[PDB]
Amino acid sequence: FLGAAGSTMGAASMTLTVQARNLLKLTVWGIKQLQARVLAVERYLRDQQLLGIWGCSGKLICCTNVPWNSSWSNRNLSEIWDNMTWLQWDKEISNYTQIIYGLLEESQNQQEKNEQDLLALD
Amino acid sequence: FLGAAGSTMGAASMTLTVQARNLLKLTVWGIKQLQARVLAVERYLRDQQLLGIWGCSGKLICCTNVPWNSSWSNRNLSEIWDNMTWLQWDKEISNYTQIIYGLLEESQNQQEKNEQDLLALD
Amino acid sequence: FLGAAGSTMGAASMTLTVQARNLLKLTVWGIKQLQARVLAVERYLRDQQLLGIWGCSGKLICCTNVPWNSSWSNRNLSEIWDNMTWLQWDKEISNYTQIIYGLLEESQNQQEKNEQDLLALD
Amino acid sequence: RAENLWVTVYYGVPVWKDAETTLFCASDAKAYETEKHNVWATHACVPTDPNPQEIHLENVTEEFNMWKNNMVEQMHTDIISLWDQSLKPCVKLTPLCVTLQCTNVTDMRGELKNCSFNMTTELRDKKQKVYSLFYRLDVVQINNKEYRLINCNTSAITQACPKVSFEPIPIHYCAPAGFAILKCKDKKFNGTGPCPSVSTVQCTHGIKPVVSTQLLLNGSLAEEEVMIRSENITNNAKNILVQFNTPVQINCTRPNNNTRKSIRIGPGQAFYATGDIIGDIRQAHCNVSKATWNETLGKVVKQLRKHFGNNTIIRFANSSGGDLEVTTHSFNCGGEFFYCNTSGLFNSTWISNTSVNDSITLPCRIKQIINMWQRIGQAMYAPPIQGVIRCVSNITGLILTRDGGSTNSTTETFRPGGGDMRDNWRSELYKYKVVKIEPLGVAPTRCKRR
Amino acid sequence: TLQCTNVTDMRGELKNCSFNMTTELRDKKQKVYSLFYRLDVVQI
Amino acid sequence: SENITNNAKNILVQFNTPVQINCTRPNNNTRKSIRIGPGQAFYATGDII
Numbered sequence: 001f002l003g004a005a006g007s008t009m010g011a012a013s014m015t016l017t018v019q020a021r022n023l024l025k026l027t028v029w030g031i032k033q034l035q036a037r038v039l040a041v042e043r044y045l046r047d048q049q050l051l052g053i054w055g056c057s058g059k060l061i062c063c064t065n066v067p068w069n070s071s072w073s074n075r076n077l078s079e080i081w082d083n084m085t086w087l088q089w090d091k092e093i094s095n096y097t098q099i100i101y102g103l104l105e106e107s108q109n110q111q112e113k114n115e116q117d118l119l120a121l122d
Numbered sequence: 123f124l125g126a127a128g129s130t131m132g133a134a135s136m137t138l139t140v141q142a143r144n145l146l147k148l149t150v151w152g153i154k155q156l157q158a159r160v161l162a163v164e165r166y167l168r169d170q171q172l173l174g175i176w177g178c179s180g181k182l183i184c185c186t187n188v189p190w191n192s193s194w195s196n197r198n199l200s201e202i203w204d205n206m207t208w209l210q211w212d213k214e215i216s217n218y219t220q221i222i223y224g225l226l227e228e229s230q231n232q233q234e235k236n237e238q239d240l241l242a243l244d
Numbered sequence: 245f246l247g248a249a250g251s252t253m254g255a256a257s258m259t260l261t262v263q264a265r266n267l268l269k270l271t272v273w274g275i276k277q278l279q280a281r282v283l284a285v286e287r288y289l290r291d292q293q294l295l296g297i298w299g300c301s302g303k304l305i306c307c308t309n310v311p312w313n314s315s316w317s318n319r320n321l322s323e324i325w326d327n328m329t330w331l332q333w334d335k336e337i338s339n340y341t342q343i344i345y346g347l348l349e350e351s352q353n354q355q356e357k358n359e360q361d362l363l364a365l366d
Numbered sequence: 367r368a369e370n371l372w373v374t375v376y377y378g379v380p381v382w383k384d385a386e387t388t389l390f391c392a393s394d395a396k397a398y399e400t401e402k403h404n405v406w407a408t409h410a411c412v413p414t415d416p417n418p419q420e421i422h423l424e425n426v427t428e429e430f431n432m433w434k435n436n437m438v439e440q441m442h443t444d445i446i447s448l449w450d451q452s453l454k455p456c457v458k459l460t461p462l463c464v465t466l467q468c469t470n471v472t473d474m475r476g477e478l479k480n481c482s483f484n485m486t487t488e489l490r491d492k493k494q495k496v497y498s499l500f501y502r503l504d505v506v507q508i509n510n511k512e513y514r515l516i517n518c519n520t521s522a523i524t525q526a527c528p529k530v531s532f533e534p535i536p537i538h539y540c541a542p543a544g545f546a547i548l549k550c551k552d553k554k555f556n557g558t559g560p561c562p563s564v565s566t567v568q569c570t571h572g573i574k575p576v577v578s579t580q581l582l583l584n585g586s587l588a589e590e591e592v593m594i595r596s597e598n599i600t601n602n603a604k605n606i607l608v609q610f611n612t613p614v615q616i617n618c619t620r621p622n623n624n625t626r627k628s629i630r631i632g633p634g635q636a637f638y639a640t641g642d643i644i645g646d647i648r649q650a651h652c653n654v655s656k657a658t659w660n661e662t663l664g665k666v667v668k669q670l671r672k673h674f675g676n677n678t679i680i681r682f683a684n685s686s687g688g689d690l691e692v693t694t695h696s697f698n699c700g701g702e703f704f705y706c707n708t709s710g711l712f713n714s715t716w717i718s719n720t721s722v723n724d725s726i727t728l729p730c731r732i733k734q735i736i737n738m739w740q741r742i743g744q745a746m747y748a749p750p751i752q753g754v755i756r757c758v759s760n761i762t763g764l765i766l767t768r769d770g771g772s773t774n775s776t777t778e779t780f781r782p783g784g785g786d787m788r789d790n791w792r793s794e795l796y797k798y799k800v801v802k803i804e805p806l807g808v809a810p811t812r813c814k815r816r
Numbered sequence: 817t818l819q820c821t822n823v824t825d826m827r828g829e830l831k832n833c834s835f836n837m838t839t840e841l842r843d844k845k846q847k848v849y850s851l852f853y854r855l856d857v858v859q860i
Numbered sequence: 861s862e863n864i865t866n867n868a869k870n871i872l873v874q875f876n877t878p879v880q881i882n883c884t885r886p887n888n889n890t891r892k893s894i895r896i897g898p899g900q901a902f903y904a905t906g907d908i909i
């Protein structure tokens with residue numbers, strides 16, 4: 001549970017699974033114990049819809065056909081996983097994050113499924 | 123966003139992706155801004171459950187082993203995608219819609235997964 | 245709808261699909277017709293999250309790479325499906341149920357997806 | 367076996383069906399900075415998207431009916447439900463039914479009554495001898511001159527909080543996920559028939575819930591020619607809604623400079639009594655410029671002849687009779703409720719294209735205790751306002767009725783309508799209707815599956 | 817306070833009661849009578 | 861019965877044929893509908909006719 005947040009990204013891939021999951025008749029305080037958990041399931045499905053519409057369709061790790069641009073954190077591979085940490089990593093990509101998101105839904109699952117439909121005809 | 127509703131079904135397949143997605147302590151009006159969005163997530167999951175139990179298991183476009191019956195809108199293929207529109211299309215299928223739904227859940231994912239289990243043994 | 249609960253597990257696999265699915269401004273009784281259906285969708289998603297994180301990612305039937313331990317209900321195959329019923333079956337596995345659950349999420353989708361990522365590189 | 371295609375599921379196909387859902391409000395997220403302790407609707411009211419989206423649907427024709435529109439009914443019940451939620455936390459005036467000893471104010475036949483009465487203090491022992499000032503419309507005598515509250519025999523009464531204001535603020539109606547709102551972009555639309563150019567929006571335009579009678583105030587202007595709308599036109603039982611081209615300047619003031627007593631009926635509660643009037647001794651009045659009202663009339667009277675025939679005599683006249691809400695122009699300015707005599711404006715007789723000074727005026731009456739929407743069991747007391755109230759609004763439309771006496775082939779006379787407030791909301795909602803989107807669709811294609 | 821009396825047989829099960837009551841106005845009371853069953857009232 | 865031999869527990873009975881029962885109020889009454897306002901009205905029991 002978050003244990004590798006201080007550790008490197010390379011070590012942080014092992015514990016990845018633990019992070020996935022951890023009368024009621026009252027007039028008042030019933031809305032206080034409700035409003036919190038309702039936005040929680042709203043925030044939950046918000047992430048999951050993105051996971052489906054992208055090239056994942058499944059949880060944990062999944063890959064895609066989107067090529068990694070050099071202009072996006074030009075780096076050494078061992079300088080990423082072995083020498084660097086996630087909080088420190090998300091910091092630089094902060095500018096290109098919205099750009100990458102577009103490539104997954106548009107360039108892939110929009111253009112991939114249609115590509116698949118054309119490859120499924122023959 | 124709905125832009126091809128007037129256009130033909132053939133042109134309407136390109137913009138398909140855009141259609142997928144667009145204090146709180148009050149005693150009153152809090153139920154007015156709540157009841158609307160709760161049935162929304164109920165209506166949302168109602169469509170998604172159908173997508174899973176059918177031969178899709180994924181969003182946007184997906185195919186199936188259900189053969190198209192001639193008795194269901196007997197047509198020319200170019201008379202469908204190239205010459206016709208979706209509102210105009212759903213109009214005729216209105217009678218066979220409930221019939222087709224049965225073929226996806228029953229004839230496929232009920233008979234397919236079991237077929238798959240028997241093909242996965244060897 | 246539950247019709248095979250008295251029947252053997254072997255006969256119970258045919259009807260499996262039927263089991264999957266069956267003003268609002270009031271100050272009171274509105275919470276009575278609400279609290280019931282909200283925990284329902286909470287209980288619903290509780291089962292579905294388990295289905296994804298395991299080796300299923302789909303509904304109805306799905307298989308896994310987890311080997312069946314002899315110590316867990318050591319039996320004859322025809323003594324299970326042909327001669328025995330589900331209520332009677334879940335009774336014995338009651339002790340090993342929590343053990344099996346661990347093998348699906350840990351031994352598989354944690355170790356499988358990573359295994360897959362390494363097999364997807366080459 | 368027999369070829370060729372196979373069924374395939376498409377998600378998000380452009381298919382919708384006419385339906386009804388529960389709509390919420392939107393305040394533009396500025397109304398919240400306007401503060402003044404929850405003005406009108408907006409409290410937790412949803413902030414409007416800074417960039418509303420309007421998508422024009424090409425090659426589309428959709429049929430609209432504004433009288434069958436369901437958005438009107440929700441808004442009508444909303445304002446009503448909104449009204450009660452405002453009066454619940456406020457101070458209830460229940461022990462104001464005490465006998466009222468009244469006398470004639472020091473001109474214009476004593477419209478105001480100076481009333482002396484006994485009242486309960488913070489303590490439950492001694493009463494309180496105090497006087498107040500009520501309009502003739504708020505009291506009724508019972509048999510010196512002895513009076514009583516006018517609402518006491520009919521129902522109960524509660525005072526509106528001085529903190530909140532009745533100031534109408536723009537409210538955008540939006541639809542939840544899976545639904546859509548259609549907008550008619552044609553310049554000339556009467557609310558019925560097919561619409562050539564249709565666009566969709568998440569939120570309707572800025573709509574100010576201005577409650578008024580015989581005059582649409584602060585509304586939306588029409589395009590080009592002025593518009594004429596009626597549910598059933600040849601039927602004289604149905605009101606005729608009019609939409610103006612150019613807005614009409616109207617002034618309504620309270621030429622009485624007043625003071626608040628703020629008497630203490632504790633513990634903790636304080637009532638705001640109307641003190642003495644310091645200023646012009648006058649009755650409330652409403653101004654309309656003679657040139658501007660006439661020009662509109664001339665343009666409007668020509669539009670009625672697109673139905674009632676090229677040549678005919680159209681005469682205008684004031685209200686026939688009924689409740690005060692029906693017979694006068696009713697609205698709210700500065701918190702006070704004016705009832706204006708529109709009889710001066712509606713006195714005219716027109717020729718085929720024409721009709722046979724620098725200003726005009728309209729006598730207005732003030733009533734603090736009101737039951738609108740025919741509500742029984744709840745009467746609201748409008749609290750007094752310090753100083754003189756002055757307000758300027760646009761007159762954007764009317765509520766009109768046609769006489770039943772016919773002589774149909776001779777001449778026709780029109781009079782100001784009233785009653786239903788849905789027509790007021792139908793004035794802004796004519797171009798919108800609610801549909802639910804049906805995303806799921808099936809189409810035949812060759813891909814099959816492995 | 818309820819001032820009651822015996823109804824005009826079967827030992828007077830019903831009581832005719834006179835009492836003071838508050839009107840719409842908070843000034844004058846109201847002298848009115850009602851009819852209650854013996855089970856709804858108790859003497860003091 | 862919950863506990864039959866126990867005399868402290870009630871015994872519930874279910875009939876075969878329904879039993880016709882008539883209960884009437886052989887007093888033809890009137891409503892005073894006195895006014896205890898503002899807005900409230902109490903319904904008093906008038907004389908029995």
Ligand SMILES: *[C@@H]1O[C@H](CO)[C@@H](O[C@@H]2O[C@H](CO)[C@@H](O[C@@H]3O[C@H](CO[C@H]4O[C@H](CO[C@H]5O[C@H](CO)[C@@H](O)[C@H](O)[C@@H]5O)[C@@H](O)[C@H](O[C@H]5O[C@H](CO)[C@@H](O)[C@H](O)[C@@H]5O)[C@@H]4O)[C@@H](O)[C@H](O[C@H]4O[C@H](CO)[C@@H](O)[C@H](O)[C@@H]4O[C@H]4O[C@H](CO)[C@@H](O)[C@H](O)[C@@H]4O[C@H]4O[C@H](CO)[C@@H](O)[C@H](O)[C@@H]4O)[C@@H]3O)[C@H](O)[C@H]2NC(C)=O)[C@H](O)[C@H]1NC(C)=O
Nearest residue numbers: 433596597598599600601602603604605768770772774775
């Ligand atoms: C919106 O508002 C508008 C207006 O603001 C509303 O419009 C109103 O709509 C109603 C309809 O609900 C109209 O009433 C109907 O009128 C028709 C037509 O009447 C006119 O024409 C008749 C014939 O004219 C032709 O013949 C003469 C002779 O040759 C010729 O000179 C002429 O040029 C033309 O060629 C006239 O007879 C009639 O006059 C009579 O009625 C006048 C109006 O009351 C009256 O002033 C006259 O003095 C005279 O008495 C008039 O000029 C009527 O046909 C119709 O009558 C049906 O309905 C009534 C109930 O209202 C019912 O009692 C009748 O029996 C009749 O029902 C018959 O027809 C039905 C449909 O076919 C059928 O189902 C019935 O079973 C029944 O038929 C039975 O009997 C016949 C024999 O009687 C038999 O053969 C059949 O087999 C069967 O057994 C209505 O009265 C209004 O006129 C109209 N308003 C105005 C101002 O015009 C609109 O409704 C509103 N809508 C909404 C949604 O809000």
Ligand SMILES: *[C@@H]1O[C@H](CO)[C@@H](O[C@@H]2O[C@H](CO)[C@@H](O[C@@H]3O[C@H](CO[C@H]4O[C@H](CO[C@H]5O[C@H](CO)[C@@H](O)[C@H](O)[C@@H]5O)[C@@H](O)[C@H](O[C@H]5O[C@H](CO)[C@@H](O)[C@H](O)[C@@H]5O)[C@@H]4O)[C@@H](O)[C@H](O[C@H]4O[C@H](CO)[C@@H](O)[C@H](O)[C@@H]4O[C@H]4O[C@H](CO)[C@@H](O)[C@H](O)[C@@H]4O[C@H]4O[C@H](CO)[C@@H](O)[C@H](O)[C@@H]4O)[C@@H]3O)[C@H](O)[C@H]2NC(C)=O)[C@H](O)[C@H]1NC(C)=O
Nearest residue numbers: 861862863864865866867868869870871872873874875876
């Ligand atoms: C639903 O409702 C029903 C009824 O409506 C309820 O039913 C009631 O249930 C209770 C149980 O909670 C009954 O009370 C118990 O009764 C038993 C049996 O008593 C009868 O039989 C005894 C022996 O009979 C045999 O021997 C004779 C001689 O040979 C022979 O002739 C005969 O035919 C038969 O073969 C009699 O001794 C006894 O008579 C005595 O009691 C009568 C009732 O009070 C009284 O009228 C007599 O005058 C006489 O005094 C009777 O006929 C009792 O054995 C049992 O006693 C236990 O519980 C009490 C507390 O109530 C406790 O004080 C006792 O010490 C005793 O507990 C011993 O046994 C426990 C279980 O083994 C053990 O754990 C204890 O540690 C303790 O044992 C210790 O002491 C012994 C030596 O004393 C020692 O050897 C051990 O090692 C250990 O140290 C209860 O009194 C009711 O009778 C019954 N109702 C009726 C009407 O019968 C039911 O409860 C309800 N249920 C629900 C869910 O609602």
Ligand SMILES: *[C@@H]1O[C@H](CO)[C@@H](O[C@@H]2O[C@H](CO)[C@@H](O[C@@H]3O[C@H](CO[C@H]4O[C@H](CO)[C@@H](O)[C@H](O)[C@@H]4O)[C@@H](O)[C@H](O[C@H]4O[C@H](CO)[C@@H](O)[C@H](O)[C@@H]4O[C@H]4O[C@H](CO)[C@@H](O)[C@H](O)[C@@H]4O[C@H]4O[C@H](CO)[C@@H](O)[C@H](O)[C@@H]4O)[C@@H]3O)[C@H](O)[C@H]2NC(C)=O)[C@H](O)[C@H]1NC(C)=O
Nearest residue numbers: 533534576584697698699700752753754755756757758759
């Ligand atoms: C249809 O739409 C139209 C247009 O949208 C609506 O017209 C609106 O009417 C509103 C009133 O209902 C009006 O609100 C007014 O805004 C004025 C301008 O505010 C701006 O300027 C001031 C500086 O002057 C800034 O500080 C402020 O932040 C704003 O930027 C205010 O001046 C108005 O306040 C005065 O009027 C209201 C009643 O209208 C009084 O209740 C209020 O108390 C004020 O009256 C005092 O002040 C004036 C001088 O300013 C004196 O002449 C007067 O006698 C009062 O003085 C006594 O009373 C005060 C306490 O009340 C006391 O301190 C003082 O010492 C004296 O004793 C008011 O806030 C909108 O501006 C106006 N719209 C537009 C565009 O102008 C119309 O209502 C709509 N129709 C319907 C049916 O709703």
Ligand SMILES: *[C@@H]1O[C@H](CO)[C@@H](O[C@@H]2O[C@H](CO)[C@@H](O[C@@H]3O[C@H](CO)[C@@H](O)[C@H](O[C@H]4O[C@H](CO)[C@@H](O)[C@H](O)[C@@H]4O[C@H]4O[C@H](CO)[C@@H](O)[C@H](O)[C@@H]4O)[C@@H]3O)[C@H](O)[C@H]2NC(C)=O)[C@H](O)[C@H]1NC(C)=O
Nearest residue numbers: 615616617618652653654655656658724725726727757758
């Ligand atoms: C409802 O009320 C509203 C608001 O009161 C009314 O709308 C206003 O109407 C008035 C008059 O119709 C109008 O006032 C004029 O506005 C002009 C600008 O648009 C001003 O320039 C003009 O001021 C001159 O005249 C005044 C009176 O004669 C002088 O006191 C003033 O100093 C001005 O004189 C100067 O200019 C001349 C040259 O023109 C120069 O020689 C002089 O030296 C001096 O410099 C008027 O005040 C308002 O503008 C209107 N307001 C709005 C918002 O439109 C409406 O008419 C009322 N309706 C009814 C039915 O009564």
Ligand SMILES: *[C@@H]1O[C@H](CO)[C@@H](O[C@@H]2O[C@H](CO)[C@@H](O[C@@H]3O[C@H](CO)[C@@H](O)[C@H](O)[C@@H]3O)[C@H](O)[C@H]2NC(C)=O)[C@H](O)[C@H]1NC(C)=O
Nearest residue numbers: 655656657658659660661662664665719720721723724725
């Ligand atoms: C009612 O509407 C009519 C228009 O239908 C108004 O008539 C207007 O009257 C003024 C004069 O008071 C006209 O101005 C005149 O202009 C001419 C041409 O520049 C000039 O020669 C004159 O000396 C005078 O300035 C005005 O043109 C005329 N309107 C039209 C459209 O011609 C009438 O004013 C309105 N009612 C009232 C209150 O006057």
Ligand SMILES: *[C@@H]1O[C@H](CO)[C@@H](O[C@@H]2O[C@H](CO)[C@@H](O[C@@H]3O[C@H](CO)[C@@H](O)[C@H](O)[C@@H]3O)[C@H](O)[C@H]2NC(C)=O)[C@H](O)[C@H]1NC(C)=O
Nearest residue numbers: 656683684708709710711712713714715722723724725726
């Ligand atoms: C309907 O409107 C018309 C038009 O305003 C009203 O006519 C007006 O009648 C008054 C009389 O009460 C006229 O006053 C007169 O003015 C003339 C000219 O100064 C003077 O000679 C007279 O002695 C008298 O003072 C007024 O001028 C006249 N309006 C016009 C424009 O001429 C009519 O009264 C209205 N009808 C009703 C029922 O309200």
Ligand SMILES: *[C@@H]1O[C@H](CO)[C@@H](O[C@@H]2O[C@H](CO)[C@@H](O)[C@H](O)[C@H]2NC(C)=O)[C@H](O)[C@H]1NC(C)=O
Nearest residue numbers: 574583584585587612613614615758759760761
């Ligand atoms: C009455 O109508 C006038 C004119 O249509 C409104 O004033 C306009 O306000 C808009 C706001 O963006 C400006 O762009 C226009 O320039 C104004 N008109 C003129 C002639 O300058 C006025 O706001 C309307 N009344 C109310 C209460 O809003």
Ligand SMILES: *[C@@H]1O[C@H](CO)[C@@H](O[C@@H]2O[C@H](CO)[C@@H](O)[C@H](O)[C@H]2NC(C)=O)[C@H](O)[C@H]1NC(C)=O
Nearest residue numbers: 469479480481482495496497498499641642643
């Ligand atoms: C309304 O009537 C009251 C009396 O009931 C007036 O108050 C009196 O005003 C005179 C001034 O002429 C004082 O001498 C008295 O002491 C006042 N009496 C009370 C009880 O206040 C009041 O002035 C009248 N209306 C107004 C203010 O003009």
Ligand SMILES: *[C@@H]1O[C@H](CO)[C@@H](O[C@@H]2O[C@H](CO)[C@@H](O)[C@H](O)[C@H]2NC(C)=O)[C@H](O)[C@H]1NC(C)=O
Nearest residue numbers: 684693694706707708709710711713728729731
């Ligand atoms: C509204 O305006 C009309 C028109 O001025 C008023 O009608 C007057 O009524 C009085 C009687 O109350 C008559 O003596 C006058 O002759 C009428 N005037 C005209 C021009 O005919 C009317 O009184 C006004 N207000 C109300 C409440 O009716």
Ligand SMILES: *[C@@H]1O[C@H](CO)[C@@H](O[C@@H]2O[C@H](CO)[C@@H](O)[C@H](O)[C@H]2NC(C)=O)[C@H](O)[C@H]1NC(C)=O
Nearest residue numbers: 821831832833834847848849850851906907908
């Ligand atoms: C119950 O008692 C009341 C009096 O407290 C009766 O009302 C009186 O009836 C007589 C008729 O004999 C009238 O003359 C009186 O004027 C009535 N007085 C009042 C205050 O109503 C009443 O009749 C008795 N019960 C009934 C109705 O039988």
Ligand SMILES: *[C@@H]1O[C@H](CO)[C@@H](O)[C@H](O)[C@H]1NC(C)=O
Nearest residue numbers: 074075076077078079080082
């Ligand atoms: C890249 O990583 C290798 C590790 O094998 C290291 O030797 C090399 O110096 C690195 N170069 C840069 C530019 O980071």
Ligand SMILES: *[C@@H]1O[C@H](CO)[C@@H](O)[C@H](O)[C@H]1NC(C)=O
Nearest residue numbers: 005006007008083084085088
């Ligand atoms: C601990 O984290 C810091 C920053 O996240 C990083 O620089 C450092 O290398 C990490 N230590 C180890 C032993 O990985």
Ligand SMILES: *[C@@H]1O[C@H](CO)[C@@H](O)[C@H](O)[C@H]1NC(C)=O
Nearest residue numbers: 196197198199200201202204
């Ligand atoms: C079917 O489509 C073809 C298009 O190549 C057209 O030539 C033919 O006439 C069509 N036939 C029918 C029966 O629609």
Ligand SMILES: *[C@@H]1O[C@H](CO)[C@@H](O)[C@H](O)[C@H]1NC(C)=O
Nearest residue numbers: 318319320321322323324326
């Ligand atoms: C196992 O099942 C077979 C059925 O073919 C049966 O003949 C055999 O006796 C069974 N053995 C045991 C140990 O259950």
Ligand SMILES: *[C@@H]1O[C@H](CO)[C@@H](O)[C@H](O)[C@H]1NC(C)=O
Nearest residue numbers: 249250251252327328329332
């Ligand atoms: C019915 O169920 C019982 C227990 O669930 C089982 O022992 C029995 O074999 C079943 N009957 C049939 C015919 O399968």
Ligand SMILES: *[C@@H]1O[C@H](CO)[C@@H](O)[C@H](O)[C@H]1NC(C)=O
Nearest residue numbers: 128129130205206207210425
């Ligand atoms: C526009 O839509 C109509 C009906 O939906 C259709 O008949 C027509 O062919 C469409 N126009 C084009 C250019 O596709």
